[PDB]
Amino acid sequence: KPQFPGASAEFIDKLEFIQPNVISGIPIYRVMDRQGQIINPSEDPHLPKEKVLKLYKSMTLLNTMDRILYESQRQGRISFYMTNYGEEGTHVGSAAALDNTDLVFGQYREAGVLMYRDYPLELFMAQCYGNISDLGKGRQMPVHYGCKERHFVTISSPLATQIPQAVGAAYAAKRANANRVVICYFGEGAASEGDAHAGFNFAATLECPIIFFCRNNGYAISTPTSEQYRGDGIAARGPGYGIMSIRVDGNDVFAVYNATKEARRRAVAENQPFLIEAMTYRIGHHSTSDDSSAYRNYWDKQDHPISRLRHYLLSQGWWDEEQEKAWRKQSRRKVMEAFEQAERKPKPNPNLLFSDVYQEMPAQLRKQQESLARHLQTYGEHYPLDHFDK
Amino acid sequence: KPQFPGASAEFIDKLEFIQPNVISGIPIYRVMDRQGQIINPSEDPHLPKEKVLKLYKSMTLLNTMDRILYESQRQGRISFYMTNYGEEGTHVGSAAALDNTDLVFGQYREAGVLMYRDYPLELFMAQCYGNISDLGKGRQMPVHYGCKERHFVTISSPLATQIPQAVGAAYAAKRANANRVVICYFGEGAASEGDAHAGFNFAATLECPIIFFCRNNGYAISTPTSEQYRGDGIAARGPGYGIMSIRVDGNDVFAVYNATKEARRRAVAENQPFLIEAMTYRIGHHSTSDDSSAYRNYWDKQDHPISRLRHYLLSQGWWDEEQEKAWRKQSRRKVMEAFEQAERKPKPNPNLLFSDVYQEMPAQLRKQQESLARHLQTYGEHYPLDHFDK
Amino acid sequence: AHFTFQEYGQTQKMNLFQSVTSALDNSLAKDPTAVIFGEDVAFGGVFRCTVGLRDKYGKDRVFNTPLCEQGIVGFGIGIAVTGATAIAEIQFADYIFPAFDQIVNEAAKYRYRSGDLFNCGSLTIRSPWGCVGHGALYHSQSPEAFFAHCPGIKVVIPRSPFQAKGLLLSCIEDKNPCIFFEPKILYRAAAEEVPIEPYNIPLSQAEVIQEGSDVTLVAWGTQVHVIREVASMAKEKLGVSCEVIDLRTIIPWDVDTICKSVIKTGRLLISHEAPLTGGFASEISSTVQEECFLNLEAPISRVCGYDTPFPHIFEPFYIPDKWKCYDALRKMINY
Amino acid sequence: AHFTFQEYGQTQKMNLFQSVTSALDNSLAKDPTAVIFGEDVAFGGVFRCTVGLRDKYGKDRVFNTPLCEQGIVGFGIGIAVTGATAIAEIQFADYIFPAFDQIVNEAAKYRYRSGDLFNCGSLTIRSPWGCVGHGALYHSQSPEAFFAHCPGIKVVIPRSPFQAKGLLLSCIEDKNPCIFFEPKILYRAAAEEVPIEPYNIPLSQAEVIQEGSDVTLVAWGTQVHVIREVASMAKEKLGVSCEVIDLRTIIPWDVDTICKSVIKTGRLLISHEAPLTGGFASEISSTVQEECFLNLEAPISRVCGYDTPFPHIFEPFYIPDKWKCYDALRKMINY
Ligand SMILES: Cc1ncc(C[n+]2c([C-](O)C(C)C)sc(CCOP(=O)(O)OP(=O)(O)O)c2C)c(N)n1
Ligand SMILES: Cc1ncc(C[n+]2c([C-](O)C(C)C)sc(CCOP(=O)(O)OP(=O)(O)O)c2C)c(N)n1
Ligand SMILES: [Cl-]
Ligand SMILES: [Cl-]
Ligand SMILES: [Cl-]
Ligand SMILES: [Cl-]
Ligand SMILES: [K+]
Ligand SMILES: [K+]
Ligand SMILES: [K+]
Ligand SMILES: [K+]
Ligand SMILES: [Mn+2]
Ligand SMILES: [Mn+2]
């Protein structure tokens, strides 16, 4: 019997390389078909009417908001935008399986989580406009949302940095004896960064109640998954770290919900990490700075998370054309009201450029703030002062 | 059938997490037993007498040199040292399976590779002493060896940085159409760094003729593998990246040789990476700065690479006590001759502190060199000038 | 917009991204070992700097990597160790930090620590740099001062398409690892004539773009255009003659051109978008003070970004614009 | 050896590593949320700074991580986001670079970019720092100037055991992410009396350790002891009275104490082991020149490490020792 400290294993007397299983990868868990029919009754979560309707309305409101803000960007009313098309199901399915206070870290394409947690339209828009109502004080580029009240950590642009932070926050929760999980969203591209390997390994060795949630949507900007990795996706990496892993149909709200619910239960109970890879497809451009026809649609017309959920609601007698029409209208109005209000608000005082760099303001920094103030007194006609508060 | 770009897989209609296989890990390939007997004749590489004797003499000469330089450090004759005890078999088994020109990157505990490639004793000692014969010009701390002639890239202290560099050098070789492989050694601790994940993934996606060789010796300084990772060792990570993987008994020269030989053949032929994890045990302290009795020996007395190889030689009639005695003596003399010569050499000109920072010397840097020269003219009695060349 | 953009054989009008492509093209045509790689470079890159090169040179020479900057730089070092030319791209300068250890501990030290047995002199890392109007904290940064404290690398920033092609060709060919920062606001902002054929601009050499006798102004990248306008404002509004200097190479920098200028004028103003504290103007200021102490008539002025992260909505108030520079100059002249 | 090491209730003789342990001990006893972690900290650490703490406080509060510095810092940020005190250790300052992106893009910017909705103020990163006689390129580095260009973090370096415990307690308790660099040569080099009970030394405040009227000397860490001896050499050999100042906090630094001193003396010499170019003395020099231009009688002198990687065998010739500083001072006095 082998004695080595580094592995538990037998001897083998014949030379055999371990081949990866890429052609028959980890199978993709699915609850409902593309016609929104339940495939296997024992897997049906039987969510109540009001909850399923909330999943549906959150995904269409996000879609409505995406359309409007994408247009706003094209016209140069906001500087930047990223849509969430095709991935709305991963957002709301997962968010609905979490407790209200489970702490969320994300990447930037997870706004449905905040929408599900009832983040006001006014605040999504305040951040994209950088206006006075923005609690981020207009400092970050659009779609870099954060909400302390709803336990949604502020997004930052550097990919995958939030992965080992989520792990630290999960460690702290363990210690606090929280009955709380942390979930950490990232895309398949971001999973290539060093920080992903750091977080995965730390989570397993330090025994953290975390859910790693990978949105695999087939592209990182222009780069297809064939240039991103050669193993069987992200899910197949989990076991190597000692992490329990599953792959789910990211266009199936109930598959996403079921996996997320069970990972959550087991993460909190056992203090062990779970990895979920949600297979989806990025239906929009990468962002407003991207024209995606330069590097590559079935998904939109034949395998869309929103259409599938809509077919499900009709099967229960929970929705019809009249209700769909009235809601299409109410949601357009709710979004256009927030949008008009967001455009009419002033931007924050230019003073806010200096605060929160440290908790307190160091005296040398205050002196720079004073310099700006005196500068604007003399030269202010050359600056867009009339748009900015005070 | 699933359509997603990110994975090749079937649907499953039931929720099932993939559990890691840690208790029955990847089995450990072994050719000879602890009595140096071949276990399975079809795996015997049948290396000729002169080659096996070279493996044996390289490992004992390294051991002899380690003893002497470790003592030299304790007395403060050199500033630092790291021994290679217990891991001599992984070094020479792997180096013997490589072509002379295969490019090697390492970590710091692989000096047997250089010894096998006939690196002079004088040069191992020149580097540890930082004397005039050192082609490294005394600039790096001891055991940071490098040899251009023997295609052994200079060691640096930052762990795992050489992993994605080895991968780039392998890419370049592919392009050059080299029939050459690159091998990249690192320990199990270093495999935790972000750079390891970068190199593994790059190797697989860019299709590089590289061998990743992990010395798993159970500890990274004081940290046992139980705090380093929770999956089944390093070998189980390979498949997740799409890399062909094997685990070998690192105390069995012929197991190491066989795996390395076959990885090399297949890496060069197919332009694909191979991962070998050699299970061993770090018999010495981590370094001269470490007292290893503060955190933890069977291995030394019952499962040592050198003793096993010695039993093998006796079984063929290839060695006996007389030969062992005469060689113990010759090797002591060869090492003490190099050692005395190394101590009597001066250190290089203090001028060499400024060259090679850039290829050329920038004028501002030359001005600092001039400043040092004028400084030593006035204040030189306060400096150890009489030990340094010119 | 806060700025206005204003012998060698056949030339064509090129914007900055086109001149980068031309430089890369000339390089791949003449150096069979040369390869270009990083995130999204295959389809032509997110700023269009590699358009048509994969079609021209092949998928083995112009290719996408996984999304891992420490891997990109480690990989480029490895290629360059073999002697092949490695042109790595980092998608925004703000994302160079994951590679900081590979650049600072590894590429900068590779020749020195090996006694010149090994090197990565044939590595160049190119990266969009500087403000863009709306890039906020992570699509605006100017990291050159972080790299200036690292012996062993060269850091180079052009101000225009003609300068960019000549300086990039210099970096690619230089026998030392080089970081080439491309001011992204200039990518599509005014074209100029750029030679079709390859040519070189020297590294470590500032360029005096306008002669003056009252004050010396130093900047690099887009900020050169800002100081050029400041010179114009100063001549017109104050009757002050400004010597305008483009530093071009951050390290090793051209100490002699700067000191020579200041010895003639007696006053120096350095300006950069990067934060004041620890920014590269501090190194210039300290050194000039040391060399031109007897000549200096006024304290050396630094007009820089504030000591904050780079903001989204406040960008117009953050940057060291023409008015900020002018006012500082006015006061320095009144000293 | 290149240096000589030379109210608050009960004290005990402590060396620098012991005073770090005392600081950590006091912190864990009074703050139930506080945890210490990094490579090899469980058994007491490779410099003995955490001896006995895991036994005292438990394996959940004093623990080993995997060998991954970007993970260590990312993990510490995450802990601190929840409001818990995270004391991360980086094994040598030379190995902080893999974490540079987490420190600079993330920890420094966390409060600002969120509008203060989130922060990691309760993170402290401790790391052995500075030369050690034989550490060569990767066990000798002084990276403070890299971090000085990053608004949002605090960087702090003590010169002694009493200073170390009071400054570390300050960093741990400060509401901003702090990097505490511990001069490793001092770990076991002379003890002094250190209060058993917790006390604080203020961040951002230099300490005038010796009053003088002819010249101001500024350094931090071990180099303070070097300038103290230089003051002594200068009094004895030249009749020069030196004001000796320990800067202690790199950023935000105590501009007023330094300028006040220089306004009185008229001459300034700054010294640090880190390379000259881009080193923090440049920021000090530039700023003093700006504030004390009318008072300065001589060019400000910087005596620093050369612009090379840190060598093994040549260390005695590399460091800015007492003779190098004295000579520069002599010349500055003759100016
Ligand atoms: C460390 C690093 N490297 C590159 C980038 C550039 N980047 C992006 C940005 O700059 C956004 C936030 C505006 S997004 C992105 C694609 C990431 O692909 P992914 O699969 O992880 O995510 P999505 O497919 O959902 O966009 C890159 C390469 C970045 N944000 N961070
Ligand atoms: C990036 C980083 N972090 C920490 C270290 C410290 N370190 C060491 C040095 O400083 C040596 C080269 C003198 S060696 C070492 C243990 C590495 O353990 P391992 O299993 O990879 O290798 P061994 O068991 O064969 O020593 C550390 C944590 C280091 N060298 N690089
Ligand atoms: Cl459009
Ligand atoms: Cl001993
Ligand atoms: Cl942009
Ligand atoms: Cl040490
Ligand atoms: K992030
Ligand atoms: K290394
Ligand atoms: K180059
Ligand atoms: K703190
Ligand atoms: Mn993606
Ligand atoms: Mn090990």
For A61, A306, A319, the CA distances from A323, given in Å and listed in that order, are 14, 15, 6
How many Cβ atoms are within 10 Å of C277's Cβ, its own excluded? 26
**Phi and psi dihedrals of C99, rounded to 5?**
-95, 5
Question: What part of D 177-216 touches C (C-beta under 8 Å)?
Answer: none
In whole angstroms, what is the distance from residue B338 CA to residue B355 CA? 27
Mapping DSSP to helix (H, G, I), strand (E, B) and coil, where does residue C123 land?
A: strand
In whole angstroms, what is the distance from residue B185 CA to residue C274 CA? 40
Interface contact B25-A18, CB threshold 8 A: no
Active site residue A193: no
Query: Is A190 among the annotated ligand-binding positions?
Result: yes
- Mutate-to-test residue for ligand 1 from A154, A157, A212, A299, highest number of ligand atoms within 8 A of CB: A157
A190 lines ligand 1 (CB under 6 A): yes
Closest to A138 (Cα-Cα) out of C311, D196, B44: C311
- Mutate-to-test residue for ligand 2 from B156, B157, B197, B229, highest number of ligand atoms within 8 A of CB: B157
Looking from the CA of residue A217, the nearest atom of ligand 1 is 24
Give the pair of three-digit tokens for residue A105. Answer: 């870290």
The answer to whether residues A241 and B3 touch, using CB atoms and an 8 Å cutoff, is no
How many Cβ atoms are within 10 Å of A179's Cβ, its own excluded? 12
Chains near D (3 or more Cβ pairs under 8 Å): A, B, C
**Residue A245, H or E segment:** strand A244-249
Burial per residue of A83-107, b for 16 or more beta-carbon CB atoms within 10 angstroms, e otherwise: bbbbbbbbbbbbbbbbeeebbbbbb
C127 lines ligand 1 (CB under 6 A): no
Give the pair of three-digit tokens for residue A350. Answer: 């230019």
- Tell me which DSSP letter residue B53 carries: H
Collect all residues with Cβ–Cβ distance below 8 Å to C94 and sequence separation of at least 6: A157, A158, C137, C138, C139, C140, C141, C143, D105
Query: Is C121 among the annotated ligand-binding positions?
Result: yes
Closest to C294 (Cα-Cα) out of D299, B81, D265, B283: D299
The pairing of strands C35-38 and B28-29 is unpaired
Report all structural domains of chain D as residue ranges with CATH numbers, in order of start: 10-206 (3.40.50.970), 207-331 (3.40.50.920)
**Residue C315, H or E segment:** helix C315-318
Residues of C in contact with A221 (CB under 8 A): 39-40, 46
Known binding-site residue numbers of B for K(+): 156, 158, 161-162
The answer to whether residues B55 and B31 touch, using CB atoms and an 8 Å cutoff, is no
Chosen from B17, B186, B232 to mutate, greatest number of chain A CBs within 10 A: B17
Looking from the CA of residue A160, the nearest atom of ligand 1 is 1
Closest to B35 (Cα-Cα) out of B205, B252, B355: B252
Note the residue count of chain B: 390
- B382 CA distance to ligand 6 centroid (A)? 24
| Alpha-carbon gap: C269 to the closest alpha carbon of chain B (Å) | 22
CA dihedral D107, D112, D116, D122 (to 10 degrees): 30
- Tell me which DSSP letter residue C8 carries: -
Of all residues in chain D, the one with the smallest CA distance to A103 is D82
Interface contact C65-B205, CB threshold 8 A: yes
Give the pair of three-digit tokens for residue B89. Answer: 């078999």
Give the pair of three-digit tokens for residue A37. Answer: 């029919």
Give the pair of three-digit tokens for residue C141. Answer: 């940064």
Chains near A (3 or more Cβ pairs under 8 Å): B, C, D
- Tell me which DSSP letter residue C103 carries: I
Query: What's the one-letter identity of residue A187?
Result: G
- Which residue reads 């992984």 in tokens? B90
Concatenated DSSP letters of C38-75 = ETTTTTT-TTSTTTTHHHHH-TTTEEEPPS-HHHHHHH
The CATH architecture one would assign to domain B1-390 is 3-Layer(aba) Sandwich (3.40)
Note the helical H segments in A108-161.
Answer: 111-116, 121-129
A282 lines ligand 1 (CB under 6 A): yes
- Which residue reads 């359509």 in tokens? B3
Cis link prior to B305 (omega < 30° from 0)? no
A219 lines ligand 1 (CB under 6 A): yes
**Phi and psi dihedrals of D263, rounded to 5?**
-60, -35
In whole angstroms, what is the distance from residue A248 CA to residue A29 CA? 4
**Mutual angle of helices A194-206 and B194-206, in 10-degree steps:** 130
Known binding-site residue numbers of B for thiamine diphosphate: 108-109, 157, 189-190, 215, 286
Give the pair of three-digit tokens for residue A158. Answer: 């550097």
Q: How many CB pairs under 8 A join A and C?
A: 124
In whole angstroms, what is the distance from residue A216 CA to residue A127 CA? 26
The answer to whether residues A324 and A111 touch, using CB atoms and an 8 Å cutoff, is no
Collect all residues with Cβ–Cβ distance below 8 Å to B50 and sequence separation of at least 6: none
Q: Which residue, by CA, sits nearest to atom 22 of ligand 1?
A: A187
Collect all residues with Cβ–Cβ distance below 8 Å to C289 and sequence separation of at least 6: C296, C300, D285, D286, D289, D299, D300
Interface contact A13-B235, CB threshold 8 A: no
Active site residue A58: no
For C54, D178, D253, the CA distances from D250, given in Å and listed in that order, are 47, 11, 5
The answer to whether residues D190 and D182 touch, using CB atoms and an 8 Å cutoff, is no
> Which one of D2, D89, D139, D144 is the catalytic residue?
D139
Query: What's the one-letter identity of residue D201?
Result: I
- Which residue reads 């004896």 in tokens? A177
Query: Is C124 among the annotated ligand-binding positions?
Result: yes
The method recorded for this entry reads X-ray
**Phi and psi dihedrals of C114, rounded to 5?**
-100, 0
What's the number of CA atoms in the CB half-sphere (13 Å) around residue D294? 2
The answer to whether residues D92 and D138 touch, using CB atoms and an 8 Å cutoff, is yes
Of all residues in chain A, the one with the smallest CA distance to D153 is A358
How many Cβ atoms are within 10 Å of D186's Cβ, its own excluded? 27
The answer to whether residues D76 and D125 touch, using CB atoms and an 8 Å cutoff, is yes
For A28, A234, B23, C263, D104, the CA distances from A24, given in Å and listed in that order, are 11, 14, 24, 73, 42
The answer to whether residues C217 and C185 touch, using CB atoms and an 8 Å cutoff, is no
In whole angstroms, what is the distance from residue C156 CA to residue C163 CA? 11
In whole angstroms, what is the distance from residue A263 CA to residue D52 CA? 37
Residue A205, Cβ density class (10 Å: 0-12 exposed, 13-18 middle, ≥19 buried): buried
Burial per residue of C297-326, b for 16 or more beta-carbon CB atoms within 10 angstroms, e otherwise: ebbbbbbbbbbbbbbbbbbbbbbbbbbbbb
In whole angstroms, what is the distance from residue D328 CA to residue D301 CA? 7
Give the pair of three-digit tokens for residue B386. Answer: 């009489």
Residue D269 pairs in a beta bridge with D217, D301
- Which residue reads 């050719």 in tokens? B31
Interface contact D306-B193, CB threshold 8 A: no
Closest to B236 (Cα-Cα) out of A194, A8, A233, A188: A8
Q: Which ligand is nearest to the CA of C91?
A: 1
The answer to whether residues C267 and C214 touch, using CB atoms and an 8 Å cutoff, is yes
Give the pair of three-digit tokens for residue C243. Answer: 């010597």
- C49 CA distance to ligand 9 centroid (A)? 19
Query: Is A157 among the annotated ligand-binding positions?
Result: yes
Query: Is D53 among the annotated ligand-binding positions?
Result: no
Collect all residues with Cβ–Cβ distance below 8 Å to D187 and sequence separation of at least 6: D15, D16, D17, D47, D48, D49, D128
Interface contact A223-C327, CB threshold 8 A: no
| Alpha-carbon gap: A266 to the closest alpha carbon of chain B (Å) | 11
Closest to B282 (Cα-Cα) out of B121, B84, B145, B119: B84
Cis link prior to D32 (omega < 30° from 0)? no
**Mutual angle of helices D255-265 and D280-291, in 10-degree steps:** 60
Closest to A198 (Cα-Cα) out of D78, D49, C253: D78
Interface contact B222-D42, CB threshold 8 A: yes
CA geometry: angle B382, B383, B388, nearest 5 deg: 155
- C147 CA distance to ligand 10 centroid (A)? 26
Query: What's the one-letter identity of residue B138?
Result: G
In whole angstroms, what is the distance from residue C12 CA to residue B383 CA? 60
Note the helical H segments in chain A.
Answer: 49-74, 88-97, 111-116, 121-129, 162-176, 194-206, 253-270, 299-302, 305-316, 321-344, 363-379
Query: Is C176 among the annotated ligand-binding positions?
Result: yes
In whole angstroms, what is the distance from residue B83 CA to residue B65 CA? 9
Looking from the CA of residue D98, the nearest atom of ligand 2 is 1
Closest to C74 (Cα-Cα) out of B193, D317, B192: B193
How many Cβ atoms are within 10 Å of A345's Cβ, its own excluded? 18
A109 lines ligand 1 (CB under 6 A): yes
Give the pair of three-digit tokens for residue D114. Answer: 């969120």
E strands within chain D? 11-14, 35-38, 62-64, 86-89, 123-129, 154-156, 178-183, 192-195, 207-210, 215-219, 242-246, 249-251, 268-275, 301-305
Of all residues in chain C, the one with the smallest CA distance to D277 is C149
| Alpha-carbon gap: D3 to the closest alpha carbon of chain B (Å) | 13
In the sheet where D242-246 sits, what is the strand order?
A: D207-210, D242-246, D215-219, D268-275, D301-305
Q: Show the 3-state SS of C221-238.
A: CCHHHHHHHHHHHHHHHH
Closest to D291 (Cα-Cα) out of C10, A173, C301, A3: C301
- Tell me which DSSP letter residue D90 carries: -
Burial per residue of C83-108, b for 16 or more beta-carbon CB atoms within 10 angstroms, e otherwise: ebbbbbbbbbbbbbbbbbbbbbbbbb
Listed by start position, the domains of chain A span 1-390
In whole angstroms, what is the distance from residue D20 CA to residue D13 CA? 13
Give the pair of three-digit tokens for residue B184. Answer: 């990249």
In whole angstroms, what is the distance from residue B16 CA to residue B37 CA? 45
Closest to A109 (Cα-Cα) out of A77, A62, A72, A147: A62
Ramachandran quadrant class, A233 (left: phi over 0; alpha: psi -120 to 50; beta: rest)? left
Chosen from C70, C103, C120, C122 to mutate, greatest number of chain B CBs within 10 A: C70
C91 lines ligand 1 (CB under 6 A): yes
- A194 CA distance to ligand 12 centroid (A)? 20
In whole angstroms, what is the distance from residue C153 CA to residue C149 CA? 9
Active site residue C211: no
A76 lines ligand 1 (CB under 6 A): no
Q: Which residue, by CA, sits nearest to atom 13 of ligand 2?
A: B157
Query: What's the one-letter identity of residue A330?
Result: Q
Q: Which ligand is nearest to the CA of B4?
A: 11
In whole angstroms, what is the distance from residue B171 CA to residue B157 CA? 24
**Residue C303, H or E segment:** strand C301-305
In whole angstroms, what is the distance from residue C149 CA to residue B45 CA? 53
Distance of CA A309 to the CA centre of its chain: 19
- Tell me which DSSP letter residue B176 carries: H
Residue C180 pairs in a beta bridge with C126, C156
Query: Is D95 among the annotated ligand-binding positions?
Result: yes
